[PDB]
Design a protein around this nucleic acid. Structure first.
Length: 149
RNA sequence: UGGCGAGUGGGUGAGUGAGG
DNA sequence: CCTCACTCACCCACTCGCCA
């Protein structure tokens, strides 16, 4: 069907440091009203931000009755999580290959739920490689990290 | 048996801090 | 783009420990 391209990014200043500040960015295009850069609530990490930037884009897509999404992110962790690992985790009790608990289980659960009824082409952006959509999403993510949660 | 911690080797990609 | 110091967490092995 007709697909729509969206660029997502999760960022986190001071990732792994004493005062991390995580933000999500979702870019639909120049001057698109759904473009957002907002603060990530909860645990402040880059991995959570990258997951919930994709979450936000999908929820926004649903509010527009869009069920075919070309979703760009630079997070292979998010992409491989949602297209591969989640199926294994629902079957094995959300255990990593080291036999440990999946740290961001509740975020992958939430994302897994949002992909229901969606046809999503998950795309890795090569990360700093001329894709202005990625740069615009990154900029919005940084803006959101400055805001309050 | 059931949990947990710390490492080593390899891999996938990200997010940073101080600088210039 | 460069240097120096790092975390985020998955894919796969392997080694050492701690609990009951």
């Amino acid at each position: 069907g007709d697909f729509v391209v969206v660029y997502t990014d999760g960022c986190c200043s001071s990732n792994g440091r004493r005062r991390p500040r995580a933000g999500i960015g979702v870019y639909w295009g120049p001057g698109h009203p759904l473009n957002v850069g907002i603060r990530l609530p909860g645990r402040q990490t880059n991995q959570r931000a990258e997951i919930h930037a994709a979450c936000k884009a999908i929820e926004q897509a649903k509010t527009q009755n869009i069920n075919k999404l070309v979703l760009y992110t630079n997070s292979m962790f998010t992409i491989n999580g949602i297209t591969n690992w989640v199926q294994g985790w629902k079957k094995n009790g959300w255990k990593t290959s080291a036999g440990k608990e999946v740290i961001n289980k509740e975020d992958f659960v939430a994302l897994e739920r949002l992909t229901q009824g969606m046809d999503i082409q998950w795309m890795h952006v090569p990360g700093h490689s001329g894709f202005i959509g990625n740069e615009e999403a990154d900029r919005l993510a940084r803006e959101g990290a400055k805001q309050s949660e």
